[PDB]
Design a protein around this ligand. Sequence first.
Ligand SMILES: *[C@@H]1O[C@H](CO)[C@@H](O[C@@H]2O[C@H](CO)[C@@H](O)[C@H](O)[C@H]2NC(C)=O)[C@H](O)[C@H]1NC(C)=O
Ligand SMILES: *[C@@H]1O[C@H](CO)[C@@H](O[C@@H]2O[C@H](CO)[C@@H](O)[C@H](O)[C@H]2NC(C)=O)[C@H](O)[C@H]1NC(C)=O
Ligand SMILES: *[C@@H]1O[C@H](CO)[C@@H](O[C@@H]2O[C@H](CO)[C@@H](O)[C@H](O)[C@H]2NC(C)=O)[C@H](O)[C@H]1NC(C)=O
Ligand SMILES: *[C@@H]1O[C@H](CO)[C@@H](O[C@@H]2O[C@H](CO)[C@@H](O)[C@H](O)[C@H]2NC(C)=O)[C@H](O)[C@H]1NC(C)=O
Ligand code: NAG
Ligand code: NAG
Ligand code: NAG
Ligand code: NAG
Ligand code: NAG
Ligand code: NAG
Ligand code: NAG
Ligand code: NAG
Lengths: 229, 314, 32, 116
Amino acid sequence: NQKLIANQFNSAIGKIQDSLSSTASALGKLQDVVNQNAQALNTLVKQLSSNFGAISSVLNDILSRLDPPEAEVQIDRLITGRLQSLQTYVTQQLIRAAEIRASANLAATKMSECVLGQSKRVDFCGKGYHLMSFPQSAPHGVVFLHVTYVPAQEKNFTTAPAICHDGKAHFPREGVFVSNGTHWFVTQRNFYEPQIITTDNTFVSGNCDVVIGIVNNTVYDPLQPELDS
Amino acid sequence: VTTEILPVSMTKTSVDCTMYICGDSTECSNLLLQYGSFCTQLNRALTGIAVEQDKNTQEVFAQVKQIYKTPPIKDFGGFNFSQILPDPSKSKRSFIEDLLFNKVNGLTVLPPLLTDEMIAQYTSALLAGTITSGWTFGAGAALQIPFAMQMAYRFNGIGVTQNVLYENQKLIANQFNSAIGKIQDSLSSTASALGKLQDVVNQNAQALNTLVKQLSSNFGAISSVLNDILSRLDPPEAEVQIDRLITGRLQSLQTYVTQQLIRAAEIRASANLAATKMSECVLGQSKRVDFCGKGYHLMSFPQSAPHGVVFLHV
Amino acid sequence: TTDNTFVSGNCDVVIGIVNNTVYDPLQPELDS
Amino acid sequence: DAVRDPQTLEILDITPCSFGGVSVITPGTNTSNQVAVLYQDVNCTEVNVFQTRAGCLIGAEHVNNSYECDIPIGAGICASYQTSQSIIAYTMSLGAENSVAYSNNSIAIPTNFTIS
Ligand SMILES: *[C@@H]1O[C@H](CO)[C@@H](O[C@@H]2O[C@H](CO)[C@@H](O)[C@H](O)[C@H]2NC(C)=O)[C@H](O)[C@H]1NC(C)=O
Ligand SMILES: *[C@@H]1O[C@H](CO)[C@@H](O[C@@H]2O[C@H](CO)[C@@H](O)[C@H](O)[C@H]2NC(C)=O)[C@H](O)[C@H]1NC(C)=O
Ligand SMILES: *[C@@H]1O[C@H](CO)[C@@H](O[C@@H]2O[C@H](CO)[C@@H](O)[C@H](O)[C@H]2NC(C)=O)[C@H](O)[C@H]1NC(C)=O
Ligand SMILES: *[C@@H]1O[C@H](CO)[C@@H](O[C@@H]2O[C@H](CO)[C@@H](O)[C@H](O)[C@H]2NC(C)=O)[C@H](O)[C@H]1NC(C)=O
Ligand SMILES: *[C@@H]1O[C@H](CO)[C@@H](O)[C@H](O)[C@H]1NC(C)=O
Ligand SMILES: *[C@@H]1O[C@H](CO)[C@@H](O)[C@H](O)[C@H]1NC(C)=O
Ligand SMILES: *[C@@H]1O[C@H](CO)[C@@H](O)[C@H](O)[C@H]1NC(C)=O
Ligand SMILES: *[C@@H]1O[C@H](CO)[C@@H](O)[C@H](O)[C@H]1NC(C)=O
Ligand SMILES: *[C@@H]1O[C@H](CO)[C@@H](O)[C@H](O)[C@H]1NC(C)=O
Ligand SMILES: *[C@@H]1O[C@H](CO)[C@@H](O)[C@H](O)[C@H]1NC(C)=O
Ligand SMILES: *[C@@H]1O[C@H](CO)[C@@H](O)[C@H](O)[C@H]1NC(C)=O
Ligand SMILES: *[C@@H]1O[C@H](CO)[C@@H](O)[C@H](O)[C@H]1NC(C)=O
């Protein structure tokens, strides 16, 4: 399916372009960080206009109006208010920064395990089975494009844990025994592609009397025709 | 089967600073406004957290696209899941879930988007999937597979050949069923098992109780009661005593909000871990050591819990 | 050899496939 | 918490006078200028009226049909703009109902796939 896979991939890239394109909501997560920081700064500056119990929020109006015995008191009122505002701001920045600290650690982990190798972690690189990913540069952050394998059409098959042959129990080395209602095959779980059940696919361990759900079939030995010929 | 318990969310509290500091007082409000927009800043900080608490719940439990029902025939090859599956005769919660739930001024508390009933519904879908369609429903569409066949893959994934399961299927099913009974008895009369969820609830309650109790403090004022100041002193003196209470009460709110933001940050991280665990422990099998308890991980099942999630690791 | 590789599909559908000889350890044994 | 009345010797409990935040529930102004108002944590007797756990919702109609959540109110309730069009309130759905055809000898195996 190389031709099909390449075509599906190329289409998928065009789809993300259109999704990211005119609609900015896709990047709301980056926009939120920028907006929250801007609001914290705007609040801090606006607080300079507050009196905090003082006769005036303007330091120059206090200095040119009151003699030191009174001016100092009004100034202390503004110092306390403005200092508390800075302390609140810095604390808020430290906490928000802690969230970013954690997000950056996760983003770095994702690049190392999603881009510089393939993780087998579920929902780590989006939905589906992870194959590959590519990073993209982004304002104040990182954007990851996750390329995953997702099953589509499925078919209804009969199954069994083992095949009973000469009284011996044959189990798949890898995969599942399946039936189309007339004949038994063995195939890989993540992509139906039925194989003839042979001694080179299965292994023998235990017997037909101990396997629940075991069925009667014929296991093929590729060697016998060769010995006979 | 061992039990791992993680918190997911906090109580969605909200505080009206006017009612808290200057309840029913025009003169106090006029003074409170001289301090700028501190209330707006604090209200936004708490509102943002209340929103994040639903974000945390959503990330941990809403991990399916469809709600999958259990089969009408509970035949899983000898494996008895009746204690973790929801009881249809009841809120449709499991026997174990009921046992877990049974062990845990101008201010208000907002409801969650997802109530215990909605969490139980997500949990039901997750178990129905885990038991009858393996991990395929996590990756994408839910594809049916016999339970015993699913276990064969789970055992192969830890270095144990599939034939071992079948030779010992009766033994394994019996050990599993016993293990489920053991966790029921462990969780049962003793509440210490859920101390991690109880601690979150207790710490939040203490923060709220402290904030309210501080209203009775003078903070250098002649009286902690705003009405006693207003009816006793003329404005030239009353305003000073009011400012003393505003400063004290405002500092108390600032301390409270900061404390809530830091505690919420811990919960933020715990919710991320809990969500990671469900995705890698329930919707697939991780090979990570000590991730899903001790031993080699095969499977796990989530359970609904008050303010959090309980994972049963097999 | 046939013990290292597996057969699936054919030479007309594989891009970049090359011509070589795959060894079968069984044939010398049948002949001997 | 409660007071024993000086004349009747009866006891009456003290509740606060109802209060709560006021939220405006709206579709974007790009498609509609119709809004509903939610009075949080209060009774409709104190404030197309729907009384719910989260408060009193005035403006939107309540319906029996559940839908996937669009814009959440809380306590199991979400709102949306639907058929001509108006704001409605409903118990949220968590997704379409489905099931697994769990026969003890049946397996589903993918035959095709896509790369997304
Ligand atoms: C089930 O699989 C068997 C085995 O491949 C199918 O049987 C073959 O059918 C083709 C087409 O008629 C014949 O040319 C082959 O000779 C048959 N093989 C054998 C061993 O008889 C069978 O048709 C399949 N049935 C279904 C419903 O798919
Ligand atoms: C596979 O076929 C054999 C027969 O060739 C089955 O063996 C018989 O099983 C019945 C019970 O159903 C016994 O009463 C007979 O005495 C058995 N015959 C012999 C020679 O032992 C075997 O059970 C079948 N297995 C499966 C999975 O179908
Ligand atoms: C699954 O386990 C439960 C117990 O945890 C079984 O319920 C008991 O069933 C017996 C009859 O066999 C009754 O006498 C008990 O009173 C039941 N206990 C309770 C608490 O109801 C249940 O039958 C088992 N189901 C299967 C299929 O094994
Ligand atoms: C391997 O060698 C065979 C010849 O033994 C190649 O088959 C020929 O390919 C050419 C095209 O290059 C055709 O024009 C001939 O008609 C083919 N001959 C036969 C008998 O079919 C084959 O293409 C070679 N494959 C590779 C990968 O080199
Ligand atoms: C498989 O077939 C059964 C009937 O035998 C049907 O009920 C089930 O829905 C089918 N599975 C799928 C995925 O369609
Ligand atoms: C499936 O269940 C039926 C009972 O309805 C039983 O007779 C049959 O042997 C079971 N098959 C397997 C593989 O468990
Ligand atoms: C490599 O590219 C050349 C074109 O320059 C092409 O002829 C050749 O078949 C390609 N080989 C493979 C394996 O893609
Ligand atoms: C007070 O007097 C009224 C009659 O005027 C009587 O009904 C009521 O019970 C009395 N209350 C008490 C406590 O005696
Ligand atoms: C928003 O308004 C524009 C016209 O200004 C319209 O083209 C677009 O479809 C509207 N968006 C939605 C979701 O209706
Ligand atoms: C609202 O008030 C009515 C009485 O007028 C009462 O019956 C009802 O239960 C109250 N509902 C709520 C949510 O308080
Ligand atoms: C739901 O349907 C019932 C009748 O079955 C009706 O009495 C009730 O008023 C309906 N509720 C709504 C919101 O339409
Ligand atoms: C898978 O489906 C696509 C259509 O979406 C089709 O073009 C492709 O050939 C199919 N592949 C297989 C193996 O069926």
